Write an enzyme that holds these catalytic residues in place. Structure first.
Site, short mmCIF file in Angstrom:
data_model
loop_
_atom_site.label_atom_id
_atom_site.label_comp_id
_atom_site.label_asym_id
_atom_site.label_seq_id
_atom_site.Cartn_x
_atom_site.Cartn_y
_atom_site.Cartn_z
CG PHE B 76 -1.96 1.12 1.16
CD1 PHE B 76 -3.15 1.00 0.45
CD2 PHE B 76 -1.72 2.30 1.84
CE1 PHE B 76 -4.08 2.04 0.41
CE2 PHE B 76 -2.65 3.36 1.82
CZ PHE B 76 -3.82 3.21 1.09
CB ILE B 78 -0.06 7.67 -0.81
CG1 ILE B 78 -1.24 6.92 -0.19
CG2 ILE B 78 -0.49 9.01 -1.43
CD1 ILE B 78 -2.33 6.50 -1.17
CD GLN B 83 3.80 9.63 1.21
OE1 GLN B 83 4.86 10.20 1.44
NE2 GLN B 83 3.60 8.34 1.47
CB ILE B 120 1.42 1.85 14.00
CG1 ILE B 120 2.48 0.78 13.70
CG2 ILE B 120 0.61 1.42 15.23
CD1 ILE B 120 3.73 0.91 14.56
CE1 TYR B 123 -2.53 0.80 6.66
CE2 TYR B 123 -0.52 0.14 7.76
CZ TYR B 123 -1.20 0.50 6.61
OH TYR B 123 -0.56 0.55 5.38
#
Lengths: 147, 147
Positions: B76, B78, B83, B120, B123
């Site tokens: 994954f 970008i 960003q 982290i 997510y």
């Protein structure tokens, strides 16, 4: 506003995806590499290797026997701290020799993007030649035949 | 002199390999991505996708159903030009919803490196939690369960 959507990868967008700009995304690269290693660990046909000069890790390679039976150099990287100093050529040569030692074949394969002039030059100096094939990702295939 | 050699990847060096410094190796990344696409194209269980905002390619994802039957977000990214502007969260959320739509399961999995604080946090905000498992590359596994 945002219009977020996802497209399957085809010849129409594959080269745009290959050219995704991920400069300086250090943490992103760590995840990319961790996923590379997960994949080689699970697939009996693939193998990852750290490239060292003595005790110093200077690069990474992933290689192995695909289907039907061709042996590919799939990934090959030299750490940016150590580029421009002859490591890529020396390590790539040694890996080539290790691969034809391991497998019965005397041919090795790789593919390259068209703008990658350094890579083409390095692989050509080591004896790879364009073989007239296109890989599934649209890259031009190169082949080394050991006589 | 040079003392070039190759080592298998194990717990002893895997994190050093994951931390290989490849900053600014633009052409190298093109080859890395082309190899990602070659791999997903061949493996019926894996899928690559370009992430778009309208007509603009802004990222990349690779996902799918592993063994035994778990559905993973494997890659994954970008694009660095885009960003810090909410795209990662919006695209990751949409992909999560698409994956539990496609597959019978209500759980999705991923793993992360320990230093990757942004990932982290992203997510976690989307509902992934650490599940006490380690992936084969030593990364800590996160899990999203859709109720």
């Amino acid at each position: 506003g945002m219009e977020i959507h996802f497209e399957k990868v085809t010849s129409d967008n594959r080269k745009a995806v290959e050219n995704l700009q991920v400069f300086a995304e250090q943490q992103a690269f760590i995840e990319s590499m961790a996923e590379n290693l997960k994949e080689s660990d699970q697939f009996p046909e693939w193998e990852s290797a750290g490239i060292y000069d003595g005790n110093q890790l200077i690069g990474y390679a992933m290689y192995g026997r695909w289907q039907d039976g061709r042996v590919w150099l799939d990934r090959f990287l030299i750490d940016q701290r150590f580029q421009g100093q002859g490591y890529g050529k020396a390590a790539c040569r040694l890996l080539m020799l290790k691969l034809i030692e391991k497998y019965q074949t005397n041919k090795l394969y790789l593919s390259v993007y068209d703008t990658n002039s350094s890579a083409i030059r390095l692989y050509q100096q080591l004896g790879f030649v364009f073989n007239g094939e296109l890989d599934t990702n649209g890259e031009r295939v190169m082949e080394w035949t050991h006589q």
